[PDB]
Design an enzyme around this catalytic site. Structure first.
Site, PDB file in Angstrom:
ATOM      1  N   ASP B  30       0.818  -1.205   0.000  1.00 40.04           N
ATOM      2  CA  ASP B  30       0.000   0.000   0.000  1.00 40.04           C
ATOM      3  C   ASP B  30       0.849   1.250   0.000  1.00 40.04           C
ATOM      4  N   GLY B 113      -4.625  13.706   6.904  1.00 41.84           N
ATOM      5  CA  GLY B 113      -4.873  14.363   8.150  1.00 41.84           C
ATOM      6  C   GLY B 113      -6.384  14.364   8.149  1.00 41.84           C
ATOM      7  N   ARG B 118     -11.363  16.031   5.783  1.00 40.49           N
ATOM      8  CA  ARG B 118     -12.670  16.576   6.089  1.00 40.49           C
ATOM      9  C   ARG B 118     -12.881  17.959   5.467  1.00 40.49           C
ATOM     10  N   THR B 132      -7.919   2.881  -0.064  1.00 42.81           N
ATOM     11  CA  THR B 132      -7.453   1.524   0.185  1.00 42.81           C
ATOM     12  C   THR B 132      -8.197   1.037   1.423  1.00 42.81           C
ATOM     13  N   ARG B 255     -39.377 -30.080  -8.458  1.00 37.56           N
ATOM     14  CA  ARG B 255     -39.729 -31.091  -7.447  1.00 37.56           C
ATOM     15  C   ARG B 255     -40.201 -30.505  -6.111  1.00 37.56           C
ATOM     16  N   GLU B 292     -19.688 -29.879   7.262  1.00 34.94           N
ATOM     17  CA  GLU B 292     -20.283 -30.708   6.216  1.00 34.94           C
ATOM     18  C   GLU B 292     -19.172 -31.257   5.335  1.00 34.94           C
ATOM     19  N   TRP B 314     -29.154 -30.989   6.080  1.00 31.50           N
ATOM     20  CA  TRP B 314     -29.577 -32.287   5.589  1.00 31.50           C
ATOM     21  C   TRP B 314     -30.742 -32.898   6.353  1.00 31.50           C
ATOM     22  N   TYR B 340     -22.824 -37.953  -1.518  1.00 31.22           N
ATOM     23  CA  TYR B 340     -21.444 -37.454  -1.582  1.00 31.22           C
ATOM     24  C   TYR B 340     -20.665 -38.084  -0.433  1.00 31.22           C
ATOM     25  N   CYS B 400     -25.492 -32.548  -6.388  1.00 29.48           N
ATOM     26  CA  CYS B 400     -25.621 -31.257  -7.050  1.00 29.48           C
ATOM     27  C   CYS B 400     -24.231 -30.856  -7.501  1.00 29.48           C
ATOM     28  N   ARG B 421     -24.763 -29.330 -11.335  1.00 32.37           N
ATOM     29  CA  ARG B 421     -25.954 -29.478 -12.164  1.00 32.37           C
ATOM     30  C   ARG B 421     -27.110 -28.583 -11.747  1.00 32.37           C
ATOM     31  N   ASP B 424     -28.849 -23.564  -6.003  1.00 34.99           N
ATOM     32  CA  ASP B 424     -29.744 -22.626  -5.340  1.00 34.99           C
ATOM     33  C   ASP B 424     -28.886 -21.400  -5.005  1.00 34.99           C
TER      34      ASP B 424
HETATM   35  N1  LIG Z   1      -4.274   5.988   6.426  1.00 31.12           N
HETATM   36  C1  LIG Z   1      -4.002   7.026   5.640  1.00 31.12           C
HETATM   37  O1  LIG Z   1      -4.226   7.051   4.430  1.00 31.12           O
HETATM   38  C2  LIG Z   1      -3.393   8.229   6.356  1.00 31.12           C
HETATM   39  C3  LIG Z   1      -3.278   8.226   7.750  1.00 31.12           C
HETATM   40  N2  LIG Z   1      -2.758   9.356   8.410  1.00 31.12           N
HETATM   41  C4  LIG Z   1      -2.712   9.374   9.889  1.00 31.12           C
HETATM   42  O2  LIG Z   1      -3.551  10.424  10.486  1.00 31.12           O
HETATM   43  C5  LIG Z   1      -2.842  11.030  11.630  1.00 31.12           C
HETATM   44  C6  LIG Z   1      -2.444  12.455  11.204  1.00 31.12           C
HETATM   45  O3  LIG Z   1      -3.618  13.210  10.854  1.00 31.12           O
HETATM   46  P1  LIG Z   1      -4.447  14.073  11.961  1.00 31.12           P
HETATM   47  O4  LIG Z   1      -4.125  13.854  13.378  1.00 31.12           O
HETATM   48  O5  LIG Z   1      -5.718  14.654  11.469  1.00 31.12           O
HETATM   49  O6  LIG Z   1      -3.502  15.386  11.717  1.00 31.12           O
HETATM   50  P2  LIG Z   1      -3.377  16.079  10.237  1.00 31.12           P
HETATM   51  O7  LIG Z   1      -2.227  15.594   9.441  1.00 31.12           O
HETATM   52  O8  LIG Z   1      -4.567  16.729   9.683  1.00 31.12           O
HETATM   53  O9  LIG Z   1      -2.664  17.410  10.794  1.00 31.12           O
HETATM   54  C7  LIG Z   1      -3.379  18.373  11.583  1.00 31.12           C
HETATM   55  C8  LIG Z   1      -2.645  19.710  11.586  1.00 31.12           C
HETATM   56  O10 LIG Z   1      -2.651  20.358  10.279  1.00 31.12           O
HETATM   57  C9  LIG Z   1      -2.801  21.816  10.470  1.00 31.12           C
HETATM   58  N3  LIG Z   1      -4.173  22.223  10.069  1.00 31.12           N
HETATM   59  C10 LIG Z   1      -5.246  21.424   9.966  1.00 31.12           C
HETATM   60  N4  LIG Z   1      -6.301  22.155   9.589  1.00 31.12           N
HETATM   61  C11 LIG Z   1      -5.898  23.409   9.453  1.00 31.12           C
HETATM   62  C12 LIG Z   1      -6.536  24.587   9.087  1.00 31.12           C
HETATM   63  N5  LIG Z   1      -7.828  24.575   8.786  1.00 31.12           N
HETATM   64  N6  LIG Z   1      -5.830  25.741   9.040  1.00 31.12           N
HETATM   65  C13 LIG Z   1      -4.525  25.760   9.340  1.00 31.12           C
HETATM   66  N7  LIG Z   1      -3.891  24.637   9.693  1.00 31.12           N
HETATM   67  C14 LIG Z   1      -4.553  23.459   9.754  1.00 31.12           C
HETATM   68  C15 LIG Z   1      -2.672  22.006  11.969  1.00 31.12           C
HETATM   69  O11 LIG Z   1      -1.293  22.118  12.302  1.00 31.12           O
HETATM   70  P3  LIG Z   1      -0.776  23.428  13.082  1.00 31.12           P
HETATM   71  O12 LIG Z   1      -1.178  23.075  14.463  1.00 31.12           O
HETATM   72  O13 LIG Z   1       0.831  23.224  13.165  1.00 31.12           O
HETATM   73  O14 LIG Z   1      -1.284  24.720  12.665  1.00 31.12           O
HETATM   74  C16 LIG Z   1      -3.226  20.737  12.527  1.00 31.12           C
HETATM   75  O15 LIG Z   1      -2.718  20.530  13.847  1.00 31.12           O
HETATM   76  C17 LIG Z   1      -1.615  10.141  11.820  1.00 31.12           C
HETATM   77  O16 LIG Z   1      -1.918   9.067  12.719  1.00 31.12           O
HETATM   78  C18 LIG Z   1      -1.332   9.588  10.458  1.00 31.12           C
HETATM   79  O17 LIG Z   1      -0.666   8.332  10.553  1.00 31.12           O
HETATM   80  C19 LIG Z   1      -2.343  10.490   7.662  1.00 31.12           C
HETATM   81  C20 LIG Z   1      -2.457  10.482   6.268  1.00 31.12           C
HETATM   82  C21 LIG Z   1      -2.981   9.354   5.623  1.00 31.12           C
HETATM   83  C1  LIG Z   2     -33.765 -26.380  -1.860  1.00 29.36           C
HETATM   84  C2  LIG Z   2     -32.387 -26.746  -1.309  1.00 29.36           C
HETATM   85  N1  LIG Z   2     -32.181 -27.946  -0.747  1.00 29.36           N
HETATM   86  C3  LIG Z   2     -30.986 -28.308  -0.254  1.00 29.36           C
HETATM   87  C4  LIG Z   2     -30.880 -29.578   0.303  1.00 29.36           C
HETATM   88  C5  LIG Z   2     -29.533 -30.009   0.866  1.00 29.36           C
HETATM   89  C6  LIG Z   2     -28.474 -29.111   0.794  1.00 29.36           C
HETATM   90  C7  LIG Z   2     -27.238 -29.505   1.298  1.00 29.36           C
HETATM   91  C8  LIG Z   2     -26.147 -28.643   1.239  1.00 29.36           C
HETATM   92  C9  LIG Z   2     -26.298 -27.379   0.676  1.00 29.36           C
HETATM   93  C10 LIG Z   2     -25.103 -26.421   0.633  1.00 29.36           C
HETATM   94  N2  LIG Z   2     -24.367 -26.492   1.905  1.00 29.36           N
HETATM   95  C11 LIG Z   2     -24.703 -25.777   2.979  1.00 29.36           C
HETATM   96  C12 LIG Z   2     -23.962 -25.927   4.151  1.00 29.36           C
HETATM   97  C13 LIG Z   2     -24.346 -25.268   5.315  1.00 29.36           C
HETATM   98  C14 LIG Z   2     -25.472 -24.448   5.309  1.00 29.36           C
HETATM   99  C15 LIG Z   2     -26.206 -24.275   4.139  1.00 29.36           C
HETATM  100  C16 LIG Z   2     -25.817 -24.941   2.979  1.00 29.36           C
HETATM  101  C17 LIG Z   2     -27.229 -23.467   4.412  1.00 29.36           C
HETATM  102  N3  LIG Z   2     -27.191 -23.127   5.700  1.00 29.36           N
HETATM  103  C18 LIG Z   2     -28.227 -22.316   6.363  1.00 29.36           C
HETATM  104  C19 LIG Z   2     -28.530 -22.831   7.773  1.00 29.36           C
HETATM  105  C20 LIG Z   2     -29.144 -24.233   7.735  1.00 29.36           C
HETATM  106  C21 LIG Z   2     -30.526 -24.231   7.074  1.00 29.36           C
HETATM  107  O1  LIG Z   2     -30.805 -23.386   6.224  1.00 29.36           O
HETATM  108  O2  LIG Z   2     -31.368 -25.070   7.392  1.00 29.36           O
HETATM  109  C22 LIG Z   2     -27.847 -20.834   6.430  1.00 29.36           C
HETATM  110  O3  LIG Z   2     -28.417 -20.012   5.713  1.00 29.36           O
HETATM  111  O4  LIG Z   2     -26.981 -20.443   7.214  1.00 29.36           O
HETATM  112  C23 LIG Z   2     -26.136 -23.700   6.273  1.00 29.36           C
HETATM  113  O5  LIG Z   2     -25.818 -23.609   7.459  1.00 29.36           O
HETATM  114  C24 LIG Z   2     -27.540 -26.997   0.174  1.00 29.36           C
HETATM  115  C25 LIG Z   2     -28.644 -27.849   0.223  1.00 29.36           C
HETATM  116  C26 LIG Z   2     -29.882 -27.455  -0.293  1.00 29.36           C
HETATM  117  C27 LIG Z   2     -30.071 -26.202  -0.871  1.00 29.36           C
HETATM  118  O6  LIG Z   2     -29.153 -25.386  -0.939  1.00 29.36           O
HETATM  119  N4  LIG Z   2     -31.323 -25.839  -1.383  1.00 29.36           N
HETATM  120  C1  LIG Z   3      -3.666   4.717   0.106  1.00 28.23           C
HETATM  121  C2  LIG Z   3      -2.729   5.403   1.101  1.00 28.23           C
HETATM  122  N1  LIG Z   3      -2.718   6.738   1.215  1.00 28.23           N
HETATM  123  C3  LIG Z   3      -1.903   7.376   2.070  1.00 28.23           C
HETATM  124  C4  LIG Z   3      -1.964   8.765   2.109  1.00 28.23           C
HETATM  125  C5  LIG Z   3      -1.034   9.507   3.059  1.00 28.23           C
HETATM  126  C6  LIG Z   3      -0.162   8.757   3.840  1.00 28.23           C
HETATM  127  C7  LIG Z   3       0.734   9.428   4.665  1.00 28.23           C
HETATM  128  C8  LIG Z   3       1.664   8.719   5.418  1.00 28.23           C
HETATM  129  C9  LIG Z   3       1.689   7.331   5.343  1.00 28.23           C
HETATM  130  C10 LIG Z   3       2.716   6.526   6.144  1.00 28.23           C
HETATM  131  N2  LIG Z   3       4.013   7.216   6.242  1.00 28.23           N
HETATM  132  C11 LIG Z   3       4.889   7.307   5.241  1.00 28.23           C
HETATM  133  C12 LIG Z   3       6.097   7.963   5.467  1.00 28.23           C
HETATM  134  C13 LIG Z   3       7.052   8.057   4.457  1.00 28.23           C
HETATM  135  C14 LIG Z   3       6.794   7.491   3.211  1.00 28.23           C
HETATM  136  C15 LIG Z   3       5.584   6.845   2.973  1.00 28.23           C
HETATM  137  C16 LIG Z   3       4.635   6.754   3.988  1.00 28.23           C
HETATM  138  C17 LIG Z   3       5.616   6.367   1.731  1.00 28.23           C
HETATM  139  N3  LIG Z   3       6.791   6.659   1.173  1.00 28.23           N
HETATM  140  C18 LIG Z   3       7.248   6.205  -0.151  1.00 28.23           C
HETATM  141  C19 LIG Z   3       6.523   4.924  -0.573  1.00 28.23           C
HETATM  142  C20 LIG Z   3       6.893   3.720   0.296  1.00 28.23           C
HETATM  143  C21 LIG Z   3       8.071   2.955  -0.308  1.00 28.23           C
HETATM  144  O1  LIG Z   3       9.136   3.528  -0.534  1.00 28.23           O
HETATM  145  O2  LIG Z   3       7.951   1.763  -0.588  1.00 28.23           O
HETATM  146  C22 LIG Z   3       6.975   7.274  -1.211  1.00 28.23           C
HETATM  147  O3  LIG Z   3       7.635   7.296  -2.248  1.00 28.23           O
HETATM  148  O4  LIG Z   3       6.085   8.106  -1.043  1.00 28.23           O
HETATM  149  C23 LIG Z   3       7.527   7.347   2.040  1.00 28.23           C
HETATM  150  O5  LIG Z   3       8.673   7.752   1.853  1.00 28.23           O
HETATM  151  C24 LIG Z   3       0.783   6.668   4.521  1.00 28.23           C
HETATM  152  C25 LIG Z   3      -0.153   7.365   3.757  1.00 28.23           C
HETATM  153  C26 LIG Z   3      -1.013   6.684   2.891  1.00 28.23           C
HETATM  154  C27 LIG Z   3      -1.010   5.294   2.800  1.00 28.23           C
HETATM  155  O6  LIG Z   3      -0.287   4.608   3.521  1.00 28.23           O
HETATM  156  N4  LIG Z   3      -1.867   4.646   1.902  1.00 28.23           N
END
Ligand SMILES: NC(=O)C1=CN([C@@H]2O[C@H](COP(=O)(O)OP(=O)(O)OC[C@H]3O[C@@H](n4cnc5c(N)ncnc54)[C@H](OP(=O)(O)O)[C@@H]3O)[C@@H](O)[C@H]2O)C=CC1
Ligand SMILES: Cc1nc2ccc3ccc(CNc4ccc5c(c4)CN([C@@H](CCC(=O)O)C(=O)O)C5=O)cc3c2c(=O)[nH]1
Ligand SMILES: Cc1nc2ccc3ccc(CNc4ccc5c(c4)CN([C@@H](CCC(=O)O)C(=O)O)C5=O)cc3c2c(=O)[nH]1
Ligand SMILES: NC(=O)C1=CN([C@@H]2O[C@H](COP(=O)(O)OP(=O)(O)OC[C@H]3O[C@@H](n4cnc5c(N)ncnc54)[C@H](OP(=O)(O)O)[C@@H]3O)[C@@H](O)[C@H]2O)C=CC1
Ligand SMILES: Cc1nc2ccc3ccc(CNc4ccc5c(c4)CN([C@@H](CCC(=O)O)C(=O)O)C5=O)cc3c2c(=O)[nH]1
Ligand SMILES: Cc1nc2ccc3ccc(CNc4ccc5c(c4)CN([C@@H](CCC(=O)O)C(=O)O)C5=O)cc3c2c(=O)[nH]1
Ligand SMILES: O=c1ccn([C@H]2C[C@H](O)[C@@H](COP(=O)(O)O)O2)c(=O)[nH]1
Ligand SMILES: O=c1ccn([C@H]2C[C@H](O)[C@@H](COP(=O)(O)O)O2)c(=O)[nH]1
Lengths: 519, 519
Positions: B30, B113, B118, B132, B255, B292, B314, B340, B400, B421, B424
């Protein structure tokens, strides 16, 4: 800038379009099509114009076509004022000013006359071509449709349809060519975000991303590449499976001495209502297919009978040296064992030799299948199997077309599903498709239904490495409409079918391609 | 006009994205993704800009990200001149002038952030969202990703991937909504000529054009409709089969007393390398599935044993009244017959009662399957079948999941194909998918391989009419990443697997939906 499209129907092989001032056939759905397409417009306040030679105008009986405007090209015909829906022009170019005005004319259609077609193309006036390919080629023609200039590429090819047993397609050719590579996968190009993300995700993970394990065929191994979003003809179900393994097929050894390229778990669909799935990109021996099928139907296991009817596929696995090699040396020259057919008519029967009389032994599935098919159609157990764990050791070859299920639609059509554990795409598959298609037709006639759909599920879909050049050649041919297959009489018992009972209508395949089997 | 995209990774259920200034998990693919996407640009002479809150800047260790320009939003941080790749702004709006200049900045990314996210959304600054989804939900979070405003629609959802047993998706949300109906079929909209022609051809012929028999699901019965070209998550293989029969399913009796809507010959694919196919759009009872499965594996046919482990599927087909009704009244309360398992471990064995000791009788396919799987992997006959024409009459219910084939990839993964064959879709299918997935995993561990792919081929795919409302509800839920399934120990013999041996990691399904079976 208005659009100019050609609309024409010509025979599949020589492009015949006319004979003694008439069409050389009578297919109403096509007249119906011609009408729909040339009437099709966006602006209710405008109209489409149909250009046509004088002779074609004579064909129409010199009477206007509702909602449209006919433009006749003639050097003699008087430029009347009478009919406002019919107008005359001295040459084709001048007429095509429909563009340069008559904003009342929304679209233009070049409707015919070998002369007008040929000129329309030659002077580069047409943008598109709507071609209805008709499958009758041994009849007289005096008018033809010129060869489509290379600047035109096909972008659509419909499934095959039937009328009075005549097969026909519908394909669209567009005058394109302002491009470059261009991806063949129709999923890409929709929006960059998705494409870029998938690519990147593809870089990060690798073989880990399932999609990378199912790469889309590269243009050079994709049949008729220009048809990207219109591969409707079901022959593409096979041609594309071919491309798919050529692209992803893993190289691997097997019991035979020739290695293959294979992928696991594939599917193919085929319509059987409007046509018979006999490949056209290569000539396929229908008689041999048939002869092997009744053989199975009869419950016969004697490979001699096939040789006698000059069918030799089971020779290899029937030879004395092969039987010796697989521990069946005690077996006679061509006694294949409890193979298909024996299991079909005598499931679990204790096999002795191909000579014994098994009448009454084992379970007769085919019989029950037919019985259950007509007495309880909606039933969900219409199954036929050849996979018998207890007989495998005695078979010259384990069943490839392992199990099939039949379904009776509400509209009384009979569909068929087949699971094939192993499939030789180059040599056998073409025959399996046709084989099960025929079997379905037979079962249908006997049970009072008509063919529905044929779906095939493959386990190990592979290509033997010694077929690579042949299949490449096959892939270079553009599909032609499927033929029609009909029975000349209603047999009473399924085993009464005889070769003479079969009619293969309108099959015009490309030359046969020789491909050798691995013993 | 530049583009502004959000990039974030948040837990699947509560959207947690941070804890004590760190991510609440460590998934390198990621970080690798984040890097690829935020670096991705067209103009080598420009750069992308990553906006982020000060705290997030602290997370990065206040060090620039190669090839990019970091824009920190802080009220305190000094607007230095030092680092040219890092620039500070007092409020989010002012910073977003990256548009209004720096033609050197090609694309903009709001990198984080909770506060900055937001605000970015609230002030309508973002065009896209790269989300992600991470599958761990019972851990501490102090930072969250706001709820995605309705103006945003998902257009892509990747398959599930695994890292340290943690499941996760990748989806793209785009801020769209200048439309109308819009066709769900991705094949349409490519070029009008093809669409118009197909429609017209569709009017002329009717049920005759196969395509009309396979109509594409109408938006109202299509799950997460906005994802048109990115339905990569394999749960769509099932959700879409559901939609497909809801759209084309023929109404028909059977049936049981409840009618169904069915179509014939369908397919579903599932990856098993990066995740386990246990539906998320509805909670599925994994324990029951397992119980089963070993039951089958053991060759057990005694329906009591299942009831004892509190599994009741069953029961219906095991009751004294059902057995009486199908001509098996001589049978004991839950003696299901050579079903089976009996066929799996004792193919063709002469069945007596569920009490007799069948040790040694019949053909042990499972055993042979495992044996053949490891001694001859490339073999094309790794088959397991339950369809025995000779035993059908004694079974409480015909098989089946009729036949399955196994394939060992070159990279030592074990894939599985299953032909069913009758299926359901509402009640059984979800369980079959999981069931055969597990079986494959077991077979793989025992044979020294790892799970590959699971392909399912359905004959009569149907929906019982009393499941319509339930399935409609299910279809309203957007899929979550698949969970992971792992074995806690390496068993020596496949029948030694015990419930305790199984680990279901990261399963976060929507509430269960009650659906009743037809006896
Ligand atoms: N999973 C993901 O994709 C990501 C996860 N993260 C995670 O989130 C956390 C960090 O984010 P979070 O805590 O929200 O902090 P943020 O990164 O948003 O940072 C907050 C700071 O940004 C500045 N800021 C925010 N809003 C304003 C505004 N309206 N005007 C001026 N400045 C502003 C402030 O800094 P200042 O106080 O210095 O003015 C504030 O303290 C971490 O745990 C990080 O790992 C972060 C990015 C991605
Ligand atoms: C009309 C019909 N008759 C059947 C007769 C015997 C079967 C035996 C196995 C399976 C497929 N296997 C499983 C294995 C486990 C579960 C279920 C199906 C369905 N099921 C229910 C709970 C038991 C139930 O419905 O009576 C559920 O929705 O969670 C199970 O726990 C289906 C049938 C059907 C079937 O799917 N449909
Ligand atoms: C989908 C997604 N979005 C994000 C957006 C902002 C983030 C900010 C920080 C971090 C975690 N912290 C770091 C801190 C440093 C680096 C990276 C992540 C990623 N990174 C490399 C990528 C990682 C690598 O080298 O394999 C880059 O080129 O940006 C860094 O140097 C993750 C996200 C994600 C994240 O982890 N996933
Ligand atoms: N299958 C299909 O899709 C179609 C088939 N057809 C078939 O084709 C046949 C008719 O076509 P075909 O014989 O070529 O005749 P055409 O319809 O082209 O008509 C030829 C006539 O058009 C006029 N004309 C042609 N070129 C010129 C020119 N350059 N300048 C001035 N006038 C010109 C001439 O008439 P004039 O002598 O009076 O000056 C010429 O005799 C029929 O059998 C018909 O059934 C027709 C259309 C479609
Ligand atoms: C693909 C194709 N293209 C053509 C182009 C020009 C043609 C000119 C004449 C004829 C045969 N002759 C006539 C003569 C009169 C009419 C029609 C065809 C078709 N037609 C109806 C359609 C037929 C119907 O009513 O069902 C129309 O609205 O245009 C006529 O009135 C066929 C073609 C074809 C044709 O038959 N098929
Ligand atoms: C490696 C391999 N081995 C086989 C062994 C037995 C088979 C039995 C039937 C079929 C499918 N059925 C037919 C039925 C008839 C013909 C062919 C196949 C192939 N075929 C050859 C001619 C006979 C031949 O190749 O020896 C051809 O290309 O026309 C037939 O006439 C295939 C095999 C294969 C097969 O397809 N491939
Ligand atoms: O109807 C048939 C008869 C068998 N074969 C091919 C498939 C394999 O290439 C070969 C059998 O190989 P094994 O399954 O025996 O390994 O014969 C077919 O394709 N179709
Ligand atoms: O593993 C199983 C057990 C059977 N069924 C369902 C399918 C049908 O709805 C019903 C059997 O119907 P018939 O095939 O007996 O008609 O049980 C399943 O879906 N999966």
């Amino acid at each position: 800038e208005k659009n100019v499209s050609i609309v024409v129907a010509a025979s599949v092989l020589s492009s015949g379009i006319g004979i003694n001032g008439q069409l050389p056939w009578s297919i109403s759905e096509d007249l119906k099509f011609f009408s729909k397409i040339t009437n099709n417009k966006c602006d209710s306040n405008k109209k489409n114009a149909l250009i046509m030679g004088r002779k074609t105008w004579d064909s129409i009986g010199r009477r206007p076509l509702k909602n449209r405007i006919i433009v006749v090209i003639s050097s003699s015909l008087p430029q009347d004022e009478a009919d406002p829906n019919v107008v005359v022009f001295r040459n084709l170019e001048d007429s095509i000013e429909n563009l340069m005005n008559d904003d009342s004319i929304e679209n233009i259609f070049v409707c015919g006359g070998e002369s007008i077609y040929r000129d329309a193309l030659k002077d580069n006036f047409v943008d598109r071509i709507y071609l209805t390919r008709v499958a009758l080629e041994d009849i007289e023609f005096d008018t033809y449709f010129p060869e489509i200039p290379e600047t035109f590429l096909p972008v659509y090819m419909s499934q095959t349809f039937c009328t009075k047993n005549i097969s026909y397609d519908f394909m669209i050719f567009e005058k394109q060519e302002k491009k470059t590579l261009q991806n063949c996968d129709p999923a890409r190009g929709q929006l960059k975000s998705i494409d870029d993300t998938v690519d990147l995700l593809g870089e990060i993970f690798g073989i880990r991303k399932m999609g990378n394990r199912h790469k889309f065929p590269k243009e050079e191994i994709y049949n008729t590449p220009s048809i990207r979003f219109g591969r409707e003809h079901y022959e593409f179900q096979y041609l594309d499976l071919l491309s798919r393994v050529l692209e992803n097929g893993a190289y691997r050894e097997n019991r035979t001495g020739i290695s293959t390229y294979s992928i696991f778990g594939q599917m193919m669909r085929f319509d059987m209502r409007e046509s018979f799935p006999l490949l056209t990109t290569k000539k396929v021996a229908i008689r041999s297919i048939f002869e092997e099928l009744i053989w199975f139907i009869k419950g016969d296991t004697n490979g001699n009978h096939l040789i006698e009817k000059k069918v030799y596929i089971w020779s290899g696995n029937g030879s004395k040296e092969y039987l010796e090699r697989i521990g069946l040396g005690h077996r006679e020259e061509n006694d294949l064992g409890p193979i298909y057919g024996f299991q079909w008519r005598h499931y679990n029967g204790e096999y002795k030799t191909m000579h014994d009389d098994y009448t009454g032994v084992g379970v007769d599935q085919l019989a029950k299948l037919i019985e259950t098919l007509k007495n309880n159609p909606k039933d969900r157990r219409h199954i036929l199997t050849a996979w018998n764990p207890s007989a495998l050791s005695q078979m010259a070859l384990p069943p490839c077309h392992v199990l099939s299920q039949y379904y009776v639609t509400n509209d009384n059509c009979l569909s068929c599903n087949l699971y094939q554990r192993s499939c030789d795409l180059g040599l056998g598959s073409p025959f399996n498709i046709a084989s099960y298609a025929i079997l379905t037709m037979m079962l249908a006639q006997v049970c009072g239904y008509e063919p529905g759909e044929l779906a095939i599920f493959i386990g190990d879909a592979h290509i033997y490495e010694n077929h690579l050049t042949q299949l490449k050649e096959q892939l270079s041919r553009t599909p032609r409409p499927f033929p029609q297959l009909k029975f000349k009489r209603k047999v009473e018992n399924i085993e009464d079918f005889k070769w003479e009972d079969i009619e293969l209508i309108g099959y015009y395949p490309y030359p046969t391609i020789k491909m050798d089997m691995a013993v």
